[PDB]
Amino acid sequence: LWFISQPLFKLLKWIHSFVGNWGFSIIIITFIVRGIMYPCFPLLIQMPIFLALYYMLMGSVELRQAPFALWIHDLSAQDPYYILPILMGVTMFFIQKIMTFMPVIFTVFFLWFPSGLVLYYIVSNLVTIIQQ
């Protein structure tokens, strides 16, 4: 949560006056967070992502126990059924040696993080889906 995090969380703030469904703050912070970003070296640049995405989930002050459609009632903290990471194996696992595993390895890595974060992951992977 270091130098790329809080200000792009303020990009999240400038977005939303009323978005009041708070998973859709995570989906809008998708479109726009990949918006201005558009201009072992996958990971060390993930600080913007997991972190400004962490202030993504955490913001702002309402996002524990907040509405999302269908099942998940807790976006702030980890998915109480872990379901979206099963979506994350479904969607992340099919893209077309150790990377024929990872979407499940990432999945059980995500199970140590909240779900909506994996949701921004899903929507990026779904840019890779709907490109074609």
UniProtKB/Swiss-Prot annotation:
Keywords, in A-Z order: Cell inner membrane, Cell membrane, Chaperone, Membrane, Protein transport, Transmembrane, Transmembrane helix, Transport
Family: Belongs to the OXA1/ALB3/YidC family. Type 1 subfamily.
GO cellular component: plasma membrane
Compartment annotation: Cell inner membrane
GO BP terms in the entry: protein insertion into membrane; protein transport
TM region(s), chain numbering: 18-38, 40-57, 75-95, 103-123
Task of the protein: Required for the insertion and/or proper folding and/or complex formation of integral membrane proteins into the membrane. Involved in integration of membrane proteins that insert both dependently and independently of the Sec translocase complex, as well as at least some lipoproteins. Aids folding of multispanning membrane proteins.
Subunit structure: Interacts with the Sec translocase complex via SecD. Specifically interacts with transmembrane segments of nascent integral membrane proteins during membrane integration.
GO-annotated molecular function: membrane insertase activity
Protein name: Membrane protein insertase YidC
Predominant place of localization: membrane
